[PDB]
Design a protein around this ligand. Structure first.
Ligand SMILES: [Ca+2]
Ligand SMILES: [Ca+2]
Ligand SMILES: [Ca+2]
Length: 160
């Protein structure tokens, strides 16, 4: 499915208008109708970002499907999807507990293999029970079939 568009499609009218407008105001010095790290650098400090010049080039090269440093009306709205949510917000001992009660398909306090297979599908491709079969085995601190908030803590802290 979509990755960035899904995060921008939720933006607020005040965001698209300010973004779509800023670009049309910062591209005035552009040449192909876009703003690369050289032109998008003035749009970030004006909006609400304090990225550096060394990381900037890396930010685009990572989200850019061609790794060039340029960003148009699309690459732009995509530069806020990675700087707002997804791989950025906090994530430590709390992110592990929430993910458990948020993926418990059986919703019974624990999770079995049939449930873990769905949790990875929400964040992984289509694997077979063969690969997800060893994940639940080593993820079980006591090898019982169900995984609670305690055993799950280790299963995610390290396994392969
Ligand atoms: Ca590009
Ligand atoms: Ca369960
Ligand atoms: Ca267990």
């Amino acid at each position: 499915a979509d990755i960035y568009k899904a995060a921008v499609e939720q933006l607020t009218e005040e965001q698209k208008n300010e973004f779509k407008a800023a670009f049309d105001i910062f591209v005035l010095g552009a040449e192909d109708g876009s703003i690369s790290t050289k032109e998008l650098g003035k749009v970030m400090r004006m909006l609400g970002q304090n990225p550096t010049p060394e990381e900037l080039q890396e930010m685009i090269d990572e989200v850019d499907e061609d790794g060039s440093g340029t960003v148009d009306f699309d690459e732009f709205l995509v530069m806020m999807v990675r700087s707002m949510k997804d791989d950025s917000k906090g994530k430590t001992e709390e992110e592990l507990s929430d993910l458990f009660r948020m993926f418990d398909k059986n919703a019974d306090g624990y999770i079995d293999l049939e449930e873990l297979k769905i949790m990875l599908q929400a964040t992984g491709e289509t694997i077979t029970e063969d690969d997800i079969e060893e994940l639940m085995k080593d993820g079980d601190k006591n090898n019982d079939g169900r995984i609670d908030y305690d055993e799950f803590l280790e299963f995610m802290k390290g396994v392969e």
